[model samples]
Target: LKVAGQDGSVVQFKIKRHTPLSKLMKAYCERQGLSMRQIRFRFDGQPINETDTPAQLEMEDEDTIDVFQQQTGG
Candidate 1:
């Protein structure tokens, strides 16, 4: 799986189709030093649940997931 950050950072990971994205997302946050609560995960233009898997999202082998930071204030 590939995750693209808003800052032009792209990270790639190899994962099983049936594995939940929670661990992967956690790893992503750790790698980027990002707070989990401040980030959002999106696939196919919608927010994705960490509990969801590659097969559950019907993701392709090289599909990219988007990561965005949450707005904290006006």
Candidate 2:
């Protein structure tokens, strides 16, 4: 699957069908030196939960996951 940051930076990687979405997000956070709670992930405008897996979500190869920084409270 391919994941992209808000700035358009993209990363392509392979993952197991049952891998949790949180795992991917955590890895991306680590790579970018950002906190997991500081970001949110979405696919096709639907928010992705940590408990969800690619297989459960019916993700396909080359599917794009958009990453956006979480907005803070006023």
Candidate 3:
């Protein structure tokens, strides 16, 4: 699966029945040099937690995943 941003740059991704979000995330974070804490997840544009969302997502092969870096200010 693949998720491209408005700039057409692919940012998020997932694999078919073979790969679970948890495993995919681990590899993704490593590749991007990001910590899991720095990641934010969303489905169809709504915020969701990977730990809670993936188990119920019912994703398919070549599914496009949308994700982003979490931001904070205070």
TM-score of each: 0.87, 0.85, 0.59
Evaluated with TM-score, which candidate comes out highest? 1
How much is 49 displaced in model 2, in angstroms? 1.3
The segments of candidate 2 whose C-alpha lies over 4 angstroms from its true place after superposition are: 72-74
Residues 1-74 of candidate 2: C-alpha lDDT, one tens digit per residue: 89888886988887999887777877778889988777778888889998999989898988888888888786
Ranking by lDDT: 2, 1, 3
Query: What lDDT is obtained when candidate 1 is compared to the true structure?
Result: 0.83
* Tens-digit lDDT string for candidate 1 (1-74): 68877998887767888888778878878888898899888897888887888888898977888988888766
Model 3 error, position 23 (Å) = 0.5
Error of 1 at 15 (Å): 0.4
